[PDB]
Amino acid sequence: YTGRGLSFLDLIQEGNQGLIRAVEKFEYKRRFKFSTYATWWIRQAINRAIADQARTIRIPVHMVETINKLSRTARQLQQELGREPTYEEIAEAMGPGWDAKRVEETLKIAQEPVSLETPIGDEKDSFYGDFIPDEHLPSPVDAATQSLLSEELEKALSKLSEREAMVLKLRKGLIDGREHTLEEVGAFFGVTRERIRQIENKALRKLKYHESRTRKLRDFLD
Amino acid sequence: TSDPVRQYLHEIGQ
Amino acid sequence: AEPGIDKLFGMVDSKYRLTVVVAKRAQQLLRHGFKNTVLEPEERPKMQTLEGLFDDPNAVTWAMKELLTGRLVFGENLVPEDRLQKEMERLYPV
Amino acid sequence: KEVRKVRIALASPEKIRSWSYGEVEKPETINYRTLKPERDGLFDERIFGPIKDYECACGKYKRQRFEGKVCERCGVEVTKSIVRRYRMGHIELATPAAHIWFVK
Amino acid sequence: MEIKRFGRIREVIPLPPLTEIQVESYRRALQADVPPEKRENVGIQAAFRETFPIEEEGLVLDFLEYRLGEPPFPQDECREKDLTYQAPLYARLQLIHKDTGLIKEDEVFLGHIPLMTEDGSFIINGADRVIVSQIHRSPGVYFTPDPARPGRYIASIIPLPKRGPWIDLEVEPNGVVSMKVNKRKFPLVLLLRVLGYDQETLARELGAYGELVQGLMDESVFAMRPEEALIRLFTLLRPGDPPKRDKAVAYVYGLIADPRRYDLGEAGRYKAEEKLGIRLSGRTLARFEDGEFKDEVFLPTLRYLFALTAGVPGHEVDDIDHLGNRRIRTVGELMTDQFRVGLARLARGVRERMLMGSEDSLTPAKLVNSRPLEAAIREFFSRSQLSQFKDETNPLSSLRHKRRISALGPGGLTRERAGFDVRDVHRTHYGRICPVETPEGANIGLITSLAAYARVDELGFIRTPYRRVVGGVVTDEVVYMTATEEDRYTIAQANTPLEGNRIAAERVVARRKGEPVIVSPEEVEFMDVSPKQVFSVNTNLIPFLEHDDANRALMGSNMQTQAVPLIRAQAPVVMTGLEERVVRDSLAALYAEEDGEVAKVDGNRIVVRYEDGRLVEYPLRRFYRSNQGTALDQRPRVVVGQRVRKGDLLADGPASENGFLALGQNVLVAIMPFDGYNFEDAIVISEELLKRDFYTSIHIERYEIEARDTKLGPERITRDIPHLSEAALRDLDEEGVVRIGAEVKPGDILVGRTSFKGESEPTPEERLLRSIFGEKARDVKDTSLRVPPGEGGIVVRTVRLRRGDPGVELKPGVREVVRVYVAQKRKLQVGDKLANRHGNKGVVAKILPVEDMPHLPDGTPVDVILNPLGVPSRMNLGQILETHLGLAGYFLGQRYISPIFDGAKEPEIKELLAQAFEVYFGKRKGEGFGVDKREVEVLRRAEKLGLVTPGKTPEEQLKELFLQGKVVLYDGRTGEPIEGPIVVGQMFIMKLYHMVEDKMHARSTGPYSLITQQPLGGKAQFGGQRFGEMEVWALEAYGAAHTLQEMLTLKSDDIEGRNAAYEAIIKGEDVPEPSVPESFRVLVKELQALALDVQTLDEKDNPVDIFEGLASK
Amino acid sequence: LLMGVTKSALSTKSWLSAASFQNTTHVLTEAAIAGKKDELIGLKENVILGRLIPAGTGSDFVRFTQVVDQKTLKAIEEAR
Amino acid sequence: SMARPVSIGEAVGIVAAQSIGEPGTQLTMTQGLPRVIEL
Amino acid sequence: MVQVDGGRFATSDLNDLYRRLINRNNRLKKLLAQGAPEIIIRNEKRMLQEAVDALLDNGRRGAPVTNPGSDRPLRSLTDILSGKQGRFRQNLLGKRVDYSGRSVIVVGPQLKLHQCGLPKRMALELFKPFLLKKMEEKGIAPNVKAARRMLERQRDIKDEVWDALEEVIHGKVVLLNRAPTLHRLGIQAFQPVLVEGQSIQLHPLVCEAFNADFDGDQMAVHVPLSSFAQAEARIQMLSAHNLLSPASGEPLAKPSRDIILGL
DNA sequence: CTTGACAAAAGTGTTAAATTGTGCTATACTGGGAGCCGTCACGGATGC
DNA sequence: GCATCCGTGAGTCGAGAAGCACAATTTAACACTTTTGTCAAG
Ligand SMILES: [Mg+2]
Ligand SMILES: [Zn+2]
Secondary structure, rough: OOOOOOOHHHHHHHHHHHHHHHHHHHOOOHHHOOOHHHHHHHHHHHHHHHHOOOOOOOHHHHHHHHHHHHHHHHHHHHHOOOOOOHHHHHHHHHHOOOOHHHHHHHHHHOOOOOOOOOOOOOOOOOHHHEEEEEEEEOOHHHHHHHHHHHHHHHHHHHOOOOHHHHHHHHHHOOOOOOOOOOHHHHHHHOOOOOOHHHHHHHHHEEEEHHHHHOOOOOOHHH | OOOHHEEEEEEEEO | OOOOHHHHHHOOOHHHHHHHHHHHHHHHHOOOOOOOOOOOOOOOEEEEEEEEEOOOOHHHHHHHHHHHHEEEEEEOOOOOOOHEEEHHHHHOOO | OOOOOEEEEEOOOHHHHHHHEEEEOOOOOOOOOOOEOOOOOOOOHHHHOOOOOOOOOOOOOOOOOOOOOOOOOOEEEEEHHHHHHHHHEOOOOOOOOOOOHHHO | OEEEEEEOOOOOOOOOOOHHHHHHHHHHHHOOOOHHHOOOOOOOOHHHHHHOOOOOOOOEEEEEEEOOOOOOOOOOHHHHOOOOEEEEHHHEEEEOOOOOOEEEEEEEEEEEEOOEOOOEEEEEEEEEEOOOOOEEEEEEEEEEEOOOOOOOOOEEEEEOOOOOOEEEEOHHHHHHOOEEEEEEEHHHHHHHHHHOOHHHHHHHHHOOOOOHHHHHHHHHHHHHHHHEEEEHHHHHHOOOOOOOOHHHHHHHHHOOOOOOOOHHHHHHHHHHHHHHOOOOOOOOEEEOOOOEEEEEHHHHHHHHHHHHOOOOOOOOOOOOOOOOOOOOOOHHHHHHHHHHHHHHHHHHHHHHHHHOOOOOOOHHHHHOOOOOHHHHHHHHHHHHOOOOEOOOOOHHHHHHOOOOOEOOOOOOOOOOOHHHHHHOOHHHHHHOOOOOOOOOOOOOEEEEEOOOEEEEOOOEEEEEEEEEEOEEEEEEEEEEEOOOOOOOOOEEOOOOOOOOOOOOOOEEEEEEEEEEEEEOOOOOOEOOOOOOHOOOOOHHHOOOOEEEEEEEHHHHHHHHHHEEOOOOOOOOEEEOOOOHHHHOOOOOOOEEOOOEEEEOOOOOOOEEEEEEEEHHHEEEOOOEEEEOOOOOOOOOOOOOOEEEEEOOOOEEEEEEOOOOEEEEEEEEEEEOOOOOOOOOHHHEEEOHHHHOOOOOEEEEEEEEOOOEEOOOOOOOOOOOOOOOOOOOOEOOOOEEEEEEEEEEEEOOOOEEEEEEEEOOOOOOHHHHHHHHHHOOOOOOOOOOOOOOOOEEEEEEEEEEOOOOOOOOOOOEEEEEEEEEEEEEEEOOOOOOEEOOOOEEEEEEEEOOHHHHHHOOOOOOOEEEEOOOOOHHHHOOOOHHHHHHHHHHHHHHHHHHHOOOOOOOOOHHHHHHHHHHHHHHHHHHHHHOOOOEEEEEEEHHHHHHHOOOOOOOOOHHHHHHHHHEEEEOOOOOOOEEOOOOOOEEEEEEEEEEOOOHHHHOOEEEOOOOOOOOOOOOOOOOOOOOEEEEEEHHHHHHHHHHHHHHHHHHHHHOOHHHHHHHHHHHHOOOOOOOOOOOOOHHHHHHHHHHHHEEEEEOOOOOEOOOOOOOOOOOO | OOHHHHHHHOOOOOHHHHHHHHHHHHHHHHHHOOOOOOOOOOOOHHHHHHHOOOOHHHHOOOOOEEEEEEHHHHHHHHHO | OOOOOOOOOOOOOHOOOOOOOOHHOOOOOOOHHHHHHHH | EEOOOOOOOOOOOOHHHHHHHHHHHHHHHHHHHOOOOOHHHHHHHHHHHHHHHHOOOOOOOOOOOEEEOOEEEEEOHHHHHOOOOHHHHHOOEEEEOOOOEEEEEEEOOOOOOOOOEEEEEHHHOHHHHHHHHHHHHHHOOOHHHHHHHHOOHHHHHHHHHHHHHHHHHOOOOOOOOOOOOOOHHHHHEEEEEEOOOOOEEEEHHHHHHHOOOOOOOOEEEEEOOOOOHHHHHHHHHHHHHHOOOOOOOOHHHHOOOOHHOOO
């Protein structure tokens, strides 16, 4: 079973676990020699270990069987067609419930990850990791626009009344908290869950008036 | 000694 | 070469002390918007633009020219940093 | 304050456990279908922190209001995802293993 | 422009096929044309017959024959669709049951074998590739002196690479001969006994020498029987394993006697017989026949070592670097080696599978699994160090790449185990390897080129031709001889005077074992074919090579391979004679197959009606993009109704003019300083060159995009890109791809694509902004393809591939792929690099108007100005001589052919200059013009420098200057003459492929790395510049503490610092103070992963937290 | 005692500078056992931490210089 | 570099290394650069 | 363990080394709970010991561990911090920087000893953050976001941007570097002069210090940002201020090939 | 400031397809398999 | 003392092959219920 993901010593240890189980179930009454029965368990453990420990991204045992069966079928067709079979041929040979789409999906599931230290070039001076950008942390440009927008929006809300600005900040989550429902805001100010809507909608209109008359807040809309 | 596989095989042969 | 560099080098005991004074003066000029300059109106550096002459926007150029005049005082333990900034704020609000 | 010196010394097993936010018990990295980190694996969120800012794995908390909180359904703390670069785990060896640096 | 020929040497043979090294080797390996029963045991045929038959040990799998099918697709289709040009391989296998005695035969599909094109290159995954030949030590038996102990010699046995271990035989100081195998030393007597050798047999053979034999006699071993010694030897070789006869014989048999593990090879076997004077039965050290081991080479090797140590006159040591001891592995040998390796793995499966599972019901197709073989072949052609991306900047670029010899590669010297010995020019390189051409730098001497007349023989030894000299008269019998065979003769020189066929010179310059000598005609036995056989093809294109320093001719030959094809390229005025052959053998042009008449001529195809009556149509490759981006197209050179003889030219290929290799332009050159624009190799050129489209080239660029399937949804290539104005989408067609013929500048959209947005809630401020304007966030975002900065051109082509297309094997999850080709016509500009064939290179630094350039008295301005200060230090005087001949040909309207080391000389050149002056000055007198006043002033100054003879008339003094190649040159700015005569002439200058347009790069912010968070690198990724240690040391030495600190934190990896610095700058403030870099934090965490407690302290030793409490529990 | 440049460099008192030069495994292991503390005296140690090197404008001799004009100095003087 | 007394705070250590090692390529690889390295 | 592009994951070797250690540690726990013989247990512990060694330093003891279907050794913790490609010499002692460019160099004889020729298109990218503020100050753009969008497309750049760019770089300097930097005069500060083209113009007198000729060499451009960085460059690193050689004290910027010939 | 109405949108809940983890086969099988190879030189250290 | 072994270094930029059963666990659907958010009415 060598050359399938697991080293030689790892296979032996997995086999030893199967051998221990055989001693527990082996019935000497039946007059069968030990190697006859113990071989089943040893092979089962060396085959289960491969399915559970041969991949960086683990796949269920049932899926591993499907992938191996797909490889068998797609190799019988190769030497039978004298060329690489297309997804339609593989799907038809597999049987019912298999189509061209499923064959492709199963093959995109069986793609191993590629190491970040694989050299590219004659020398050992460049690697894959040198060419993969970091797209998680905001860039300096994106950080600046976020701060600029908050500064411009803050001044715009300064033209409104004190309560309306608080209503919009609370209702819109400018206080770092999720948008508080009208009610929740109504309990904050002890007013109806309809009054908050009326003032909030009114104030939202006035902000609309000012921006149209100044156009100092549209370039941020992307 | 330096070969784990060689060392194991010797142990089980005893 | 920077104008009057030979004169500047002879005003300090270490060429690195000149850089610190020049760099610190530039920060003072930028922070107060050039309102604390010790240069008279006919001495302020100018840059030639299409519209016309305008004040030079480079603060490091201003600091070097101010030092050559001799109206600046530099040294160690002159005044506490906290009180140095507070007086500069009051004299030249920004 | 400001850094003035840097010291290096051996780490005791007690200190190593003080660094860790939890023990890694399984070799699973991520789920082969949903692509999310697997529980108790090498990328577990309950150990090394949330993947995205102020958002637990179950998606019950989704705002900065609950900062420093630990969701009950999953166990993922509601904090910045940068902590995922600074937090460590540990593996509890069944038997002691010598450090090669001090042997070879 | 009639061509004048110089020279006296008459060559008896023409240049051999220049690419036969790449082509002949592959034909021999495949043997795809010979009938199966006529195939010999070479190439992949020997690989089949070696592994087969496979025996289970009563099942036998035998091999009968093989065949190759037609390629599935043509070459053109493979390039477009990213396929591999290959042919299927089938083998006829029959299963024989030794038990029953039954045979079952069927044909099994083994895989695909890549095919080689007509020019000698492969198409691997749609990209042209070349397999480079490798030079290594020839297998055999060698005798080198012992470095530690004088008077001692060591015998070494070397097998084929990776076909056995190296054996060493040495006489120990004790007197005991020791054999070293796999770094294990033991007495050779033990093995000698294993081969059934008695004490008397050794004494009778090795006893007729000094005391050496006595050290070879130990009574303990000899009393031991050969089988008894077999077990003890097994224990010595590999101790620990249980000593068994079955195991001991198997290990020993396969170590030195298994024809499937130890292969001396044809070259090794032939060398062994040549040296030891024996005939080896096979290619193995020992033979295991009839249940016993029989010696083959061990005893003969010991004899040679003994006699050499004793001091017999006839035995001598071997030189490892001698070209007779070094052989070349061509493409055919390299491929078959990988074929044998893959075949072996297939045999392992056939065995492990024939002893398991329904053994009775078995067929040859069932046992065989070819996937192992198909992988070994695919790996070699894709992931090998000798399989290199083809170089096709110009036709000469690709031709040289196929004639390159490399000592590196899998199974060869590294760049650390490579020392002066291997990089030197051995005396045997004469006529086999070019001494000048080599990559300057760290690979100098490790990569070389085959000579012009050399040809690699069957065994891999380079041979060179020599003319037989008999009775003092030169004959036409040309003999190809190897270095070892060449050492037995006196070889004269090609330039020896001949009065017909008899040597005329009484004293002949010859060579005896590489050392020059002076001999008489009666002592000469061979002669050189011509001076061309000593240099490579690239060095044979340099005229006046005998006047150039070797260090500078190396640059000139290398730079010829970097010239770009020009739309108005012209052949050089001064040629060497190889310009026609290079184009013919590069398969770039198109030639008539036989006598006929042209029926149709078009910019796309030529139809020729031959004598036999058949019509042949030749499509023309037009505006095709090469590997380097250059445009390669063929232009018809015939007209309808024109009669064409066999071999006539039908269409010019890239970089050729009427069948002549034309890599540059012929320009009028003045050698003089000019206002400092010539400083340190810079060049000054006239604006007139740009006006007439001189040095204008066409380059094509390809851009590719993909539409894939995603969990969120599929990417769709559409013209309806969100938040884009009609100005940006003006040139996109209905399908979202740019229309052909549109002009695209940087920032423009090539193909529009939209991708589903990842589910993510927007920030509270963004949500408020959307509410104000009443805009609902869309479910798609702009991810289209745009022109990168600094690029552009005219769209010329667009190729669209979709899943399910015939022959299109798209990777899983890829719906379609779109490719756009953009072509731009580049003119000469400041910063572009020019050069000539004599190693003079520089960048254009100024482009003067026509009225500023110096002009001749008749009003002709010069085209280029070269600084004379570059000549004296480099000692490349060939360019000066080329200019003198060019000036003569400029006024006479003719071209010249001067072969290297046999061609034009100053007496011949000065005679031409005399004729040119009559046209140059005779024309002036006829028009009614005398001598200019300015010309008289210069003549007065010139006579003071000793350039002209006093007392002569101005016309005669002017002629004296002209014969020296100098003319009176006026200044275009002032109109006064240059105070001294200047050297003017015509030079052939090539435009190199290194252009400033492709190299200028700048960046303020962009992508950052994953782990370190530092800026990426390279122009393609928009990366920054590397501030290495040496650059940090410069800032430390300057005392720039604050400038250094920024490059380390603010501008590289201080995530908080860099974000704040950018925001401050755009706000009109000064950048803030930097903080701890993110790279130091990574180092601390990695040290902690090693179980080391790294702690940063403060003035009082109190711990300081640099992680901002994010790592504190 | 006399020693070469390599040995004289590897036996320096700072582990941060010695570790970055050569024998990283040997240097780090020897320092960890002894619990060494790098005082950040040289230039390499400050470069690694991204601090201000103690040379040129970053030296203690000139790093604390103050510049002030005549008017403000008098105001501070009298404001005493 | 200035023909005057050295200013306090200069990195004379780095200048010594660069000055000595810069002309190294000009020293023909008990003679030449090999001699300097052993010294 | 990232998802490159939108296909295939990329992972470091440390994940493989950790997985091997966890797999063997977990297996040892199972074997101990089952009361396996000493031969089995002894083998498991030895394997667990070898798993740790490879994680900490692969290759020091025994044959290096390699990934399946490959002979490339896995990268351990020790190899990360050691060697020319390690953390110390690759990311701590030297880094890649922003606000940096590169291009071919040509000779400019009309320049002063303290000037250099910087292409306009390089200056536009190097000084982008400064340029955006200047555009906003004038009427060129309404805000920084609008200004940045203008510079994205080459055909959207008006002619006033080049006038604003001329104001931004007034007085400032840039550092020119040619590798290898064998002495301190391999990095010098010049006053840029915007020029039409794509090559950097270098003063003839500073070629000897750089050891640079004009056969196709290239140089890198770096932009000091703060006043302290600008003050140091304009005082200590300026080309016109470093005229004598620190090694010997003799002139280093002196007449050269063509200048000597004329005089 | 609310009033009763609508229309959801969000949350909860049970089911049932669907995926995933686990145990078991009884003729006799009883110690692996690939390397093979052009460096130069100090330190710096066991061993007899 | 010597040998013999064994680690540590060796320039810089850029561009480059088992199957099946059955139990345990999770995801998907359609149902209801309950907050929200809106709208004519002062
Ligand atoms: Mg150069
Ligand atoms: Zn949660």
